[PDB]
């Protein structure tokens, strides 16, 4: 019952590594953008986001529900749109990363909703 968070985060990590990181040519979004290859990236993108640091956030148990998890996932696509443009080949790839994530989230919807409530009802019964 305290593994409710450990289970939720384990599922989130596998979604990232087994489904999102499996999108064809998604390798530029696997890791923080190398400043050596695009120098001005951190001068135009103020909230940079990638899959590797989503996984580091998962390992720190930052996401207690899929809402905050999706906030950082959608941030990858928002940053590609702001940097690469809406019609970019990179942006279309990031859109498919976001697509396969929403896909497998509704795939596990009934299961995750259980974990999400058991995590939060434990959060409130612990501070109460
Ligand atoms: C070849 O490319 C890269 C290589 C490497 C690299 O470490 N490779 C070397 C490793 C050592 N080895 C000895 C030699 C190879 C890193 C980044 C590249 N490019 C890239 C990454 C991410 C984005 C990106 N590019 N782009 C492209 C346009 C800017 C924005 C857009 C974008 O959103 N994103 C997230």
Curated annotation (Swiss-Prot):
Query: What does its PTM field state?
Result: Phosphorylated by casein kinase II in vitro.
Where in the numbering of this chain does the Bromo domain appear? 1-108
Where does the UniProt annotation locate this protein? Nucleus
- Domain of life the protein comes from: Eukaryota
Record's subunit section: Component of the TFIID basal transcription factor complex, composed of TATA-box-binding protein TBP, and a number of TBP-associated factors (TAFs), including TAF1, TAF2, TAF3, TAF4, TAF5, TAF6, TAF7, TAF8, TAF9, TAF10, TAF11, TAF12 and TAF13. Interacts with TAF7; the interaction is direct. TAF1, when part of the TFIID complex, interacts with C-terminus of TP53.
The record's comment about this protein's domains reads: The Bromo domain mediates interaction with histones that have acetylated lysine residues at specific positions. The second domain also recognizes and binds histones that are butyrylated and crotonylated.
What is this protein's function per UniProt?
Answer: The TFIID basal transcription factor complex plays a major role in the initiation of RNA polymerase II (Pol II)-dependent transcription. TFIID recognizes and binds promoters with or without a TATA box via its subunit TBP, a TATA-box-binding protein, and promotes assembly of the pre-initiation complex (PIC). The TFIID complex consists of TBP and TBP-associated factors (TAFs), including TAF1, TAF2, TAF3, TAF4, TAF5, TAF6, TAF7, TAF8, TAF9, TAF10, TAF11, TAF12 and TAF13. TAF1 is the largest component and core scaffold of the TFIID complex, involved in nucleating complex assembly.
What disease association does UniProt give?
Answer: Dystonia 3, torsion, X-linked: An X-linked dystonia-parkinsonism disorder. Dystonia is defined by the presence of sustained involuntary muscle contractions, often leading to abnormal postures. DYT3 is characterized by severe progressive torsion dystonia followed by parkinsonism. It has a well-defined pathology of extensive neuronal loss and mosaic gliosis in the striatum (caudate nucleus and putamen) which appears to resemble that in Huntington disease. Intellectual developmental disorder, X-linked, syndromic 33: A syndrome characterized by intellectual deficit, delayed psychomotor development, delayed speech and language, and characteristic facial features.
**Stated family:** Belongs to the TAF1 family.
Name of the protein in question: Transcription initiation factor TFIID subunit 1
What is the organism lineage in this UniProt record? Answer: Eukaryota, Metazoa, Chordata, Craniata, Vertebrata
Quote the gene name from the UniProt entry.
Answer: TAF1
Q: Which region of the full protein is contained in this chain?
A: 1521 to 1648 of 1893
């Amino acid at each position: 019952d305290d593994d409710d968070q450990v289970a939720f985060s384990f599922i989130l990590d596998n979604i990232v590594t087994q489904k999102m990181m499996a999108v064809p040519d998604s390798w530029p979004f696997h890791h923080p953008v190398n400043k050596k290859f695009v120098p001005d990236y951190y001068k135009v993108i103020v909230n940079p986001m990638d899959l590797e640091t989503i996984r580091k956030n998962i390992s720190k148990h930052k996401y207690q529900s899929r809402e905050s998890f999706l906030d950082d996932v959608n941030l990858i696509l928002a940053n590609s749109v702001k940097y690469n443009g809406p019609e970019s080949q990179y942006t279309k790839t990031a859109q498919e990363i976001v697509n396969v994530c929403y896909q497998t989230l509704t795939e596990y919807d009934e299961h995750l909703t259980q974990l999400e409530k058991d995590i939060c009802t434990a959060k409130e019964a612990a501070l109460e």
